[PDB]
């Protein structure tokens, strides 16, 4: 196995260039080819080329012959086993179309005759070009609704309103908290900017004798938010039980 | 894409289904290697088979390969919930890297329908001093993964301000989708209630909220 780690998503203007990074570790970085693949909406998957670390050799697909440039830096030995590595992708003159998530992946050398073939994955990184300012989510409480009266459970949240670009990442009392969590896919408004949504269900006797905080991460915009989910409901059926 | 695959299939839980993967010589199949992702939309893939019938390691051996002449083909046996997903067939060789296929959502016939789990938020005080006002209608756990959604004042249709997401696949391989629906703190507090309708396969579920108490 191991790591693959990529740098956080990016917002960059049309023409601008974007250098994404990939940080290995827990196998020997010399010996596995490097890939970059991403998504588009435009084109869905598309391979865009390898590196191997131990030559430099190089592999880029026809389309990205004259705008990408890859590199990587030297192995840093650990143990027999593993070493830490980087690697790096820069592409260059970007267009809306770029806009898309891009992987870094290592190859699978089982594959006798294409030991390249991407096998274990990096997280991702989120790429977005627009002309558009970055904006930082307003953060709202969504107040305790009822979800079952006789099961005594309810369920609280977090409105993050408008916010660009994606993405954003939202925990429950920094991450104590994920049994019950439900975060929901952003909406894209009109506006151009994005909304999302996460709610727990929890017991509605928590309500009095358990903080809920969620923790909103927008690093785009270098803003975090910690909103305290005021728990006195103005849900008629849970009401009651106040 | 050059690379072909069927746009859809589907098979029943406990049974097969087979897609394949084809297209002009310069991709497939003939000297071509041909490998099988699951590409679940908004996730990183996991490579299935390689070298046409190789199981990547630790893939359940309920995953095969095969590759004639003509074609490629994956087939998954024994369904489960979890297979229910997006399939990408990529054609490659020692010197040229992946062209993908143009994709296969496979969908799991034979599972139990499942009611969405709908609730309403009105409002925060913060918003609207702010001043804003958003309802927010959260919708999950619901099977097959199709709803729609229609909002209410009072007792008359809504359509200014509503935007609803498509619905996407949680975990538990059931389904989830939010909708929104924007006011002036003004339309808030000039009705008597606001409601979000949530239609799944011909059934209608409401949750209902109002100003009085807030």
């Known amino acids: 196995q191991g790591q693959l780690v990529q740098s956080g998503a990016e917002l960059k203007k049309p023409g601008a260039s974007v250098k994404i990074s990939c940080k290995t570790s827990?196998?020997?970085?010399?010996?596995?080819?490097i890939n970059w693949i991403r998504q588009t909406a435009g084109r869905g998957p598309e391979w865009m080329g390898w590196?191997?670390?131990?030559?430099?050799?190089?592999?880029?697909?026809?389309?990205?012959?004259?705008r990408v440039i890859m590199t990587t830096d030297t192995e840093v030995p650990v143990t027999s086993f593993t070493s830490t590595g980087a690697a790096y992708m820069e592409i260059r003159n970007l267009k809306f179309d770029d806009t898309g998530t891009y992987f870094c992946?290592?190859?699978?050398?089982?594959?006798?005759?294409?030991?390249?073939?991407?096998?274990?994955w990096g997280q991702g990184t989120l790429l977005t070009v627009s002309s558009a300012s970055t904006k930082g989510p307003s953060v709202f409480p969504l107040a305790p609704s009822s979800k079952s009266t006789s099961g005594g459970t309810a369920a609280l949240g977090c409105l993050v309103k408008d916010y660009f670009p994606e993405p954003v990442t939202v925990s429950w009392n920094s991450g104590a908290l994920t049994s019950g969590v439900h975060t929901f896919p952003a909406v894209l408004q009109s506006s151009g900017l994005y909304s999302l949504s996460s709610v727990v269900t929890v017991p509605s006797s928590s309500l009095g004798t358990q903080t809920y905080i969620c923790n909103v991460n927008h690093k785009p915009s270098n803003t975090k938010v910690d909103k305290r989910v005021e728990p006195k409901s103005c849900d008629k059926g849970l009401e009651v039980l106040f | 894409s050059v690379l072909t695959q069927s746009a859809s299939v589907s098979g029943s839980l406990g049974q097969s289904v087979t897609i394949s993967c084809t297209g002009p010589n310069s991709v497939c199949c003939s000297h071509k290697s041909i490998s099988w992702y699951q590409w679940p939309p908004g996730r990183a893939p996991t490579l299935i088979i390689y070298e046409d019938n190789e199981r990547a390691p630790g893939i359940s051996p309920r995953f095969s390969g095969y590759k004639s002449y003509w074609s490629a083909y994956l087939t998954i046996s024994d369904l489960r919930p979890e297979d229910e997903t997006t399939y990408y067939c990529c054609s490659y060789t020692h010197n040229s890297g992946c062209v993908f296929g143009t994709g296969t959502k496979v969908s799991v016939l034979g599972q139990s329908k499942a009611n969405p789990s709908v609730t309403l938020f009105p409002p925060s005080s913060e918003e609207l001093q702010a001043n804003k006002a958003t309802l927010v209608c959260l919708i999950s756990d619901f099977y097959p993964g199709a709803v729609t959604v229609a909002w209410k004042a009072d007792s008359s249709p809504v359509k200014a301000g509503v935007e609803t997401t498509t619905p996407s696949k949680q975990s538990n391989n059931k389904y989830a989708a939010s909708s929104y629906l924007s006011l002036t703190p003004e339309q808030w507090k000039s009705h008597r209630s606001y409601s979000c309708q949530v239609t799944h396969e011909g059934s209608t579920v409401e949750k209902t909220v109002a100003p009085t108490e807030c």
């Open positions: 992946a290592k190859g699978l050398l089982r594959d006798g005759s294409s030991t390249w073939l991407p096998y274990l």
């Open positions: 590196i191997s670390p131990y030559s430099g050799d190089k592999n880029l697909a026809p389309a990205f012959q004259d």
């Open positions: 827990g196998y020997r970085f010399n010996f596995y080819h």
